[PDB]
Amino acid sequence: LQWGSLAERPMVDRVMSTSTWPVPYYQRLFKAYPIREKKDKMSLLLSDIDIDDTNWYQAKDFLRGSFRGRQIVDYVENNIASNTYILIQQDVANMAKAYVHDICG
Amino acid sequence: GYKIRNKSIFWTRAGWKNNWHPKNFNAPRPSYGEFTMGIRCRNDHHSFLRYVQTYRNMSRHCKQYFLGDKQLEETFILGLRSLFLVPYDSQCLTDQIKHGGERRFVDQLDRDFELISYNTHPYQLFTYTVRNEHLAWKNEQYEKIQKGEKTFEQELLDYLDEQVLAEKAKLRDGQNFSIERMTEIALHVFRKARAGKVRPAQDVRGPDGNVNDFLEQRRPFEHPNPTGVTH
Amino acid sequence: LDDIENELSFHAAIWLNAYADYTMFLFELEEYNDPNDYLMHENFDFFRGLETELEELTETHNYIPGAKDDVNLRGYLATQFAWGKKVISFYRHPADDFKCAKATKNMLGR
Amino acid sequence: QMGFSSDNPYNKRWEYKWKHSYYTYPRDYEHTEVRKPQDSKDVPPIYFAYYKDFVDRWLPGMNMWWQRRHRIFDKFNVYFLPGMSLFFYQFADLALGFKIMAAFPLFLAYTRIRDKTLDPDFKETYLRDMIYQNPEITKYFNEETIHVLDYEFEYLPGYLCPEKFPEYQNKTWQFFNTDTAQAEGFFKFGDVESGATMTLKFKTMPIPGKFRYQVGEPFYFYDLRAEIKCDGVYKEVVLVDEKESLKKIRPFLFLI
Amino acid sequence: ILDYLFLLDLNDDLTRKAVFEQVIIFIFIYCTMNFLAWSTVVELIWPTHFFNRRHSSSQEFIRFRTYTEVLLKISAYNDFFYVLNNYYYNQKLILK
Amino acid sequence: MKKPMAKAYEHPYNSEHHPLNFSAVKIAETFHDFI
Amino acid sequence: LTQYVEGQIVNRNQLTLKKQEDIEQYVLKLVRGYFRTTNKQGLNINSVLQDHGLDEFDSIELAMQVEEDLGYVISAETIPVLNKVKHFVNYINHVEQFKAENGKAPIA
Ligand SMILES: CCCCCCCCCCCCCCCCCC(=O)OC[C@H](COP(=O)([O-])OCC(O)COP(=O)([O-])OC[C@@H](COC(=O)CCCCCCCCCCCCCCCCC)OC(=O)CCCCCCCCCCCCCCCCC)OC(=O)CCCCCCCCCCCCCCCCC
Ligand SMILES: CCCCCCCCCCCCCCCCCC(=O)OC[C@H](COP(=O)([O-])OCC[N+](C)(C)C)OC(=O)CCCCCCCCCCCCCCCCC
Ligand SMILES: CCCCCCCCCCCCCCCCCC(=O)OC[C@H](COP(=O)([O-])OCC[N+](C)(C)C)OC(=O)CCCCCCCCCCCCCCCCC
Ligand SMILES: Nc1ncnc2c1ncn2[C@@H]1O[C@H](COP(=O)(O)OP(=O)(O)OP(=O)(O)O)[C@@H](O)[C@H]1O
Ligand SMILES: [Mg+2]
Known part of the structure; x- marks a missing residue:
């Protein structure tokens, strides 16, 4: 499928319009919403x-x-002693001690 | 942007930001056994067990219309818990509510379950609508895969994977391909892909690469302006 | 080593999912402009889910504004100069009544 | 036996106590398992809310009166109050005061029937406070790990043995009362932490307290026994013995 | 057949009371008034709800996810959100 | 890829033009269709 | 007796344990099957549910699943005391002993 140029932006951003005299007096109050659809x-x-x-x-x-990813999920839910799945790292105790047990060899 | 400047915005006659015990004239006063003949009170100690049973009811009566969708049942549990954990996590001191916060929340959830038992609760109707749109999009991806075709999501991932290789093959001075740089690459593809949905890609120009689309256009003859005058 | 390799992987996947949440919001926010120049029902479509929460308040007759909001900031802005400045108590239903009554040896229940 | 009982399967001993904030009743009774969408009937039929209030509030209330109909068949409720109402009903057209004097004994009869047909409710928080002070029970039971397996509490019919309770051989009291206002029941308990079970049998009676006319405690445990069963140990704890309790206090003999 | 059905008569209502024809006028007015009042009260909870749910959050407190926000994140994500997560996971967790 | 479910539950009394529950949002849409 | 499973109507089967070794295996499989349970292999007979990411509301969902598998009718007064794996095993034993002695289900 075609992707165009990654360096360019959509054409909507590049199209422009300028004003002139005379100018419509009307000031838009609301944005039009004729069909109630906001999918995706x-x-x-x-x-x-x-x-x-x-x-x-x-x-x-x-x-x-x-x-x-399936290996990570099954390992964490089985072989990790944590009282919560909301893992928050505030210390490198488990990280450093897991390195000293492996770098000896 | 803009902050409230009034330093007394959260002041109430009962204290700062007090929405648990607003100050009124008929304030609660104690009772003495020796001096009290009779009393008419509706407070009891049944709210805890009513809190447990209401959860079991709201959980089980809603799973009746889940059709065994396991992922929907687990999603509903997470949503049902957010509704029951309101008194435990709110800034409001729910243990200091005027006439018993436990009774108030239990009676509030019973009104929700009554609507749940009839399958008319707006949370239920919202779950059915959201899940149907999600399954229709998953079935669309499945039918394209059974045909050996490539999904639109897989083509974006493969296109994003090749742009990262191109950007990191020129990044030799630095070697930290941060998450910030990865994000702006994907967001730029997303903006062009999003604009491509309303205006598809016909030629090498790509999605939304035609300047003639933005010339003066008119409504088709078979679909005029239905709501207002045109001139 | 493989224990923390899979632990830090899931830990990153959690916070990468939160990073994608904040990123995709700022992406969708580009299509939202002038919140004061949208119709009532179009603003509720951008914030999908607010109409449903509004229906739950109506169907349960919680028609006291801000009763189920922890911080009823709108309630405080409306009562900056109100006599007996107070906001509605949390989760206050307009139908509940916790009034009591007692009879003592003294008159008027005293 | 619980007098107020609907087709609801859960929480039978709390059905009369729990005051729901429901506008009307739930469409179905509380499910015992996850059901199918076709198991329940969408849009229940017309006049469903009126039908539910009759079978969940009216009907079980009448079954409560019928179950304990033997406690209201006294000569005062049967002959005196209706006989008094008929005497003044013959002059109901003479003045308004005869209509009131003919309706008051009817309202008085309803109140005696209403109070006597209710389930016997003791102060359970006094009971649990009493069993958790015993060291032999707290060895195997705790509030955080105890669960109820069976509950029974019902009034005793008729007058008791006229040697253990001579109080009830009173012709003036028998005119108003057909039963003894005493109740008897048990409590099947279990501890999920220690694996022990016990049957807490109890007998209650109304006693006078500290005052001349008012009853002190309508349900005073004058006999309280616990048959604790464990893995291989069977203990029998006597919290309140009736031979020592009946020598100190006597029943109250409610009138009206 | 019974005489209770005679209450359906309006041809000869002037022979008995002639009150029904005037009382229902108030009842129709009373319903119109309560319609204007009650609809105003119940409908006008939306400006408060729309403002609080979009402006009442602060950084020194935790904003907790509601029921609708749980279902929308898990079962109402678009294709761009699905791609961005798998794009992050493939580049950092798999391809390092 | 596992075959997903065909469809979720479809409420027999809720439609987009005749929503079962009431709110000011639907009244707002019918109002602006009128004016 | 039938329930929907992933959109298909499947007949639900009931279990009868009547043995101490089978009750422990069922409860462990029950708790491990819950999607909120953490450290599923570190779970044993003396495991506190709080140490595995479970709160009071998760015990209700677990008790609800026991009623599905075993056909029990568990009252709301019993659920809040089930906070360990041992508590579920002892409660199931007490229910089987009660029905074997009294010939009826415990009060619900
Ligand atoms: C066309 C279709 C439509 C037709 C519609 C019309 C048809 C309607 C039909 C109605 C009749 C059938 C309904 C009743 C059937 C019950 C049959 C039965 O077998 O029951 C036995 C059953 C015993 O069950 P059990 O436990 O198995 O028995 C075991 C042993 O036998 C137990 O042994 P025990 O020794 O313990 O004895 C227990 C027994 C003892 O039984 C007795 O001994 C009998 C006593 C009856 C006394 C009645 C007279 C009282 C006054 C006498 C005073 C005399 C002395 C003073 C004289 C002064 C004169 C001024 O207790 C009772 O059962 C009596 C309960 C109360 C009855 C008295 C109610 C008084 C109402 C007064 C107004 C009467 C108006 C009548 C209508 C006429 C005008 C229209 O008892 C019941 O089921 C009780 C049912 C509920 C009570 C119903 C009484 C009426 C309550 C309604 C309240 C409103 C009353 C009317 C007021 C209207 C004006 C305001
Ligand atoms: C016209 C369109 C329809 C309109 C409908 C009516 C709209 C009413 C709008 C709200 C006004 C309601 C006024 C209530 C009192 C407000 C002031 C207050 O709270 O007192 C605090 C007051 C004021 O204290 P303060 O601190 O808030 O203000 C003091 C003033 N400064 C700041 C200047 C010093 O404090 C008190 O403790 C006085 C207590 C007296 C309370 C008197 C209340 C009597 C009326 C209430 C009962 C009415 C029942 C009617 C229902 C009938 C049912 C059939
Ligand atoms: C003389 C001929 C008969 C005379 C006419 C008698 C008409 C009696 C019925 C109309 C009056 C009913 C009062 C309505 C207000 C109270 C509602 C109520 O009952 O609540 C129940 C209440 C319910 O209790 P509750 O209201 O306190 O709430 C229950 C507590 N919660 C909510 C927690 C569960 O129960 C009672 O009050 C006790 C039983 C009262 C029985 C009512 C009258 C039954 C009469 C049976 C007559 C049968 C023969 C006639 C029909 C035969 C077939 C044709
Ligand atoms: N200290 C109190 N102060 C005010 N009202 C009370 C008080 N105690 C009870 N009431 C009211 O009187 C009712 C009866 O009280 P009661 O002690 O019999 O309830 P209970 O559920 O049976 O307690 P328990 O479980 O200990 O037996 C209560 O429902 C309550 O509305
Ligand atoms: Mg009691």
């Missing part, structure tokens, strides 16, 4: 919500679509 656009409510359960749930959903 995500809700703007999903703006500044903090991290929560939906993040690790949707992560597994997209990870399970790949071979490597």
